[PDB]
C-alpha cells in the first residue's frame, strides 16, 4: 500500500532506498542465492497486487498497480480515476483501486505495443529524474493525450519496474541523478530487458553451475556476450528473478 | 521442479583465458589433460560433456585424477577401465572443481601453454579459478562504484572517477579464472597488497595466479574474495583519497558494485 | 567568443545571468524601450558572429555558431570538428571554427526541417536541463545519428536562441530548473516562437501606440489573443526584436 | 526607416473593459461621447480610425472636446467645422490619451455604461488608462515570480506559491484600463495599501478606479506604477512572508515578473 518515492527531495542515496525496499516486498525467496518471485501457484487473487506511489508534490501523485509476479505494473491510479491496461485480467480490476472510477487504456503492457502507441522505440525516449517528475506531473493532471500515456508509461515502468529486476537498470538510473543528465537505454539495458524470463529459468535449472541454454546478451558495443554460467560477471546484473521452477 | 534430464556440453576457460585441452587430441586411456589455447572454432579435444553421473567426459571418455594426492595429475581415461571415484566430479558455483573423494580440486600450476594439470589442495588460487562454457572470451565491461562513479586505472594501482564509457580506463575484462584486468595490460591483475583487513587494492603480476587475484561478482552487489572472506571497499567511503580496500561485508553503498558492460 | 553557460552547477540564478549576458550582446539597440537587433546592413561579415560555450564536464563542451543577427544558430562545434546547417552561407563557413575540420548536416536550420529529421514534432520533445546535458554529451561524443543530432539541436536552440527572444522561454526553462522536472512547450510558447519576425515588424511601425496589423497568438488553452497595441501586456514577452526598420 | 503611410482603425477598450462609444449610433455634431459595452461584433459607432493629422476618426467625424477646461465633455463633431487644435489627440505608449493644447487627458468619470467621457488633468488613474483595438477582452494569465513561483490570489490580499496552470487562483485577467483583476472576483484589483515606498499591494474595489491600481507591463521586466514611479517587489527577496509590496526600481531579480498566458 504505502511503498512510495517521493521524487521531491531525490537523492542517489533517497531512491536506492526506495528500489530496494520495493525489491524486498517483491523478493519471494532465494534460488543459488539470487532473489526470486513468489510461485503464481503461492498466491491467492486478493493477496496478488502492489501500491507504488510516486509523489511528485503532495498535492501531486500517481499510484502503480504492481503485480506481485512480475513485476509487471498492471495499472494507475490518479487521483479519483484509475486506468488499466488492455490485458490485466479481471483480478487487477476488482482488487485494485477499487473505489474510484475504472478505465481502460488502448494498448498492451509489454513494450512492443506501449512502443507501437508511443510512435517511439524504447530507444529514443529518455530517461532522468526530471522526466519521471514530468510523468508524475502529466499522468496526475489527467490529460487523454493516448500518444504521451504510453510514452510517459514505458519511463515509469523503466525507472521501477526495470529498475527493480536490473542492478544494471537502477545504477544508470543512480548515475543520471547524481549526474543531472537524461540517458537513453543501450543495447546492454534492452538486452536485460528483453532476456528476463529466459535468463531467470536457466539460472534455475543451472546443474553443474552450467546453464542449459545459452542466454545471449548484447553489450554496449553490440557483441554478444554469450553466457552459459551461473558464475558469470554479467549473471550478478540480474537481482530480481521470475520464478519459474524449484530445485 | 526443475528436472535433470539435461547434460550440457560446454567447454571451459581458467587461468590467463585457456582452455581445458586433451593433448594433441589423442585419447589413448593415461594421456595428460592440457591448458592450450582457446582454438577458434570448437574442437571435441576442448568440449566437454557434464554428465548426471557427475563425470566430465570429452568424446566419451572421462576427466580423471592419476591420484589422490596434492600434485598427481589430471588425465584421459576410459571412464570404465576407470577407478570409480576417481572420475567423479564437483563444480560449485563459486568456480571451483573439486574432487569429492580427494577433497583436492583442479588447478593449473604453470604458465606454459603447454601446462598440466594436477588436484591440488584448495587455497582459492586465481589458478584454481574455472568458467564453463562455450564462449571463453574474458568479459569486457565497466565496473561502477558508488553513484557516478568507475574504476579507473593508472599504471599500477586504480582508484574511482567519473563514469565515463569513453575513457578507456575504465574498461576491465574479467578472465574464466576470476582475475580482473585492465584491457590496456592485461597482464595485470586486481590483488591485494596483502591479505589484511586493510590493504589497498593494487594491480599485480598475474604471472603469479594467486589467492588474493581471484575475484567473485557476487549476486549481493558485492566484489568478494572467497581466500579473504572480504569484499571491496571504498576507504571511509571518501573517494577523494584514492583507495579502494579489502574488508568485512557491511553492505552499505560503499561496498556496492556493478557491471557496466 | 567566451560567452558560456557551465551546466554543471548550475541554478535559477546562474542560467539567468548567461541569458542576460547573451541578450546583451546580440542588443544592437533600444526600439520603444525594446532592445533590437542591429541592421545587417550596420555589421561587416567578419564581424557576423558569436560563440556560445555549453559545458557539461570540462572535459566536456560543445560551441554554438550564432549569427548576430538572428540569433539564429548556424553551427556547433564539437571539438576537433565543427557542423553547419545546410543553408548557413559562405560567410558562417569561412568565419566561424576556423582551424576545424567542417562537415555540413543535412538538413536546414528552420524547424519545420529539423522537425522533418527528427521525426518529431517541437512539442513532443522535452525540454530541461538534464536534457540539455544529454544533449551536450551527446553532440560531444561524435556519434552521426541524424535522426537526434536533430532532436538535440531542437533541444539547444529553444533553450537557448529563443530563449534570449522571449521573457517567457526564460522563465519555463528557470521554472523546470527550480522544479527540476521536464517540460515540452505549450501553445503559448509556440506562438512566440512562430510570431517573431511578425510581432517584431509590429512594434517598429507603431504609431498611436497601434500596431498596424493585428498579431495573432494563441495561449494556453488555444484560444487567440489578438494583439494591436504597443501597451499591450503580451507585447512584454518580447526581449529580442529582430531589426526591420528605424521609426 | 518604418514608412507612415498606415492609418489603422480600432476600437478602444478602457476602463472597467468597456468600449468607446457614438452615443446611439448618432452623428450630429455636439453628441457626447460614451462608455458603452463593447457589442459582440464590430460596429461603426464603436471604431475609430487613427489618422496621420493625429485626429481619431468615427465615421468620418472627430473625437472633440467641448473646451480646454478639465470636466469638459468630448463629444462627436464634424471636423472641418471643429475647432482646430480640440480634435487634435495623442495616444502614448503609456496608455493615456492626451489632448496637446489643453492638456488634458481623456478619462471616464462614472461606473455607469451610459457614462460620458470627460477631459481630466491627468493622474494616472485607471479611469484615464486606454488600451486600443480590436479585441477588447482583458488578457488573461498567469503572472510568474521568482523562479517556480506565480502571484496566487486568496480572498482580499496576495502572495507567492508554486506555479501550477490547474490552480484558478493563479489566473489574472488584465484589463484595457490596466487593471489586474482576479478572473474569480473581477470586481477586486491589485491596489497600493497607500502611495508609499512601502506598501503592501492588497486587492480592493475597482468601484474607485484609482491612480493606484492601474499597472504597467513595462518591457524591462518590471510591472510598473506610473502614478508612484513604484515598481511590484517581493518584500526582502523571501517569499514566506506572503507580501509583495511597492518599491522603487533595483532590477534585482525580486522585482521581475512573467506574464505566463
Ligand atoms: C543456432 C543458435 O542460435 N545457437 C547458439 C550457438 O550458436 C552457440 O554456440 C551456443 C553457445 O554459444 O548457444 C546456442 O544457443
Ligand atoms: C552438437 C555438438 O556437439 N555441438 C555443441 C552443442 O551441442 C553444445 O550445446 C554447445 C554448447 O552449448 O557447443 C557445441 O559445440
Ligand atoms: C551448509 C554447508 O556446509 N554447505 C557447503 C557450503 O557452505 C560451501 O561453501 C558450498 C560451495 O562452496 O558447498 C557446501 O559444502
Ligand atoms: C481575415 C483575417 O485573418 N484578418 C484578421 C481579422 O479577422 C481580425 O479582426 C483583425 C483584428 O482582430 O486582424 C486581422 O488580421
Ligand atoms: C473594413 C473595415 O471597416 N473593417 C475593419 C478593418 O479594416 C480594421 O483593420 C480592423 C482592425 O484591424 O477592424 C475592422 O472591423
Ligand atoms: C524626453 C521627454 O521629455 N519626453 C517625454 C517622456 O519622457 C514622456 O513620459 C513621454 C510619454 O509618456 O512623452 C514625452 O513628453
Chains 1, 3 share one sequence.
Request: some cysteine; glycine content about 6%; proline content about 4%.
Amino acid at each position: 500500500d504505502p511503498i512510495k518515492f517521493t521524487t521531491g527531495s531525490a537523492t542517489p542515496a533517497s531512491y536506492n532506498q526506495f528500489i530496494d525496499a520495493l525489491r524486498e516486498r517483491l523478493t519471494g525467496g532465494l534460488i543459488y542465492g539470487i532473489p526470486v518471485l513468489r510461485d503464481p501457484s503461492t498466491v491467492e487473487k486478493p493477496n496478488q497486487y502492489v501500491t507504488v506511489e510516486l509523489s511528485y508534490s503532495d498535492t501531486v501523485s500517481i499510484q502503480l498497480g504492481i503485480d506481485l509476479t512480475n513485476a509487471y505494473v498492471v495499472a494507475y491510479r490518479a487521483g479519483s480515476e484509475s486506468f488499466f491496461f488492455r490485458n490485466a485480467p479481471a483480478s487487477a480490476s476488482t482488487y485494485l483501486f477499487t473505489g474510484t472510477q475504472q478505465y481502460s487504456l488502448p494498448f498492451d503492457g509489454n513494450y512492443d505495443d506501449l512502443e507501437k502507441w508511443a510512435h517511439q522505440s524504447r530507444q529514443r525516449i529518455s530517461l532522468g529524474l526530471e522526466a519521471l517528475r514530468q510523468g508524475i506531473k502529466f499522468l496526475r493532471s489527467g490529460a487523454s493525450d493516448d500518444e504521451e500515456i504510453a510514452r510517459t508509461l514505458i519511463v515509469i515502468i523503466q525507472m521501477v519496474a526495470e529498475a527493480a529486476r536490473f542492478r544494471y537498470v537502477s545504477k544508470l538510473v543512480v548515475i543520471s541523478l547524481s549526474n543531472r543528465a537524461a540517458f537513453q537505454p543501450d543495447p546492454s539495458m534492452l538486452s536485460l530487458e528483453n532476456t528476463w524470463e529466459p535468463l531467470s529459468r536457466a539460472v534455475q535449472h543451472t546443474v553443474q553451475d552450467t546453464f542449459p541454454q545459452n542466454v545471449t546478451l548484447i553489450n554496449v558495443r553490440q557483441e554478444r556476450v554469450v553466457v552459459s554460467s551461473l558464475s558469470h560477471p554479467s549473471v550478478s546484473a540480474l537481482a530480481l528473478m521470475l520464478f519459474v521452477c524449484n530445485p | 521442479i526443475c528436472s535433470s534430464h539435461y547434460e550440457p556440453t560446454v567447454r571451459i576457460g581458467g587461468r590467463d583465458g585457456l582452455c581445458v585441452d586433451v593433448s594433441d587430441n589423442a585419447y589413448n586411456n593415461g594421456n595428460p589433460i592440457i591448458l592450450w589455447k582457446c582454438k577458434d572454432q570448437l574442437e571435441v579435444n576442448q568440449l566437454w560433456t557434464l554428465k548426471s553421473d557427475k563425470t566430465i567426459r570429452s568424446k566419451g571418455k572421462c576427466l580423471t585424477t592419476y591420484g589422490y594426492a596434492p600434485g598427481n595429475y589430471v588425465m584421459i581415461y576410459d571412464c570404465s577401465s576407470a577407478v570409480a571415484e576417481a572420475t567423479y566430479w564437483d563444480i560449485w558455483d563459486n568456480g571451483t572443481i573439486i574432487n569429492p573423494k580427494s577433497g583436492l580440486v583442479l588447478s593449473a600450476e604453470s604458465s606454459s601453454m603447454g601446462g598440466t594439470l594436477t588436484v591440488q589442495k584448495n587455497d582459492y588460487r586465481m589458478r584454481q579459478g574455472w568458467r564453463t562454457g562455450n564462449d571463453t572470451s574474458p568479459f569486457v565491461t565497466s565496473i561502477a562504484g558508488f553513484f557516478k562513479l568507475c574504476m579507473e586505472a593508472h599504471g599500477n594501482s586504480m582508484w574511482l572517477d567519473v563514469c565515463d564509457i569513453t575513457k578507456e580506463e575504465q574498461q576491465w575484462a574479467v578472465y574464466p579464472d576470476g582475475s580482473i584486468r585492465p584491457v590496456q595490460n592485461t597482464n595485470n591483475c586486481l590483488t591485494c597488497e596483502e591479505h589484511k583487513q586493510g590493504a589497498t587494492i593494487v594491480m599485480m603480476g598475474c604471472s603469479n595466479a594467486w589467492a588474493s587475484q581471484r575475484w567473485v561478482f557476487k549476486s549481493d552487489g558485492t566484489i568478494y574474495n572467497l581466500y579473504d572472506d572480504m569484499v571491496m571497499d571504498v576507504k571511509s567511503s571518501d573517494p577523494s583519497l584514492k583507495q579502494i580496500i579489502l574488508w568485512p561485508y557491511t553492505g552499505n553503498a560503499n561496498q556496492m558494485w556493478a557491471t557496466l558492460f
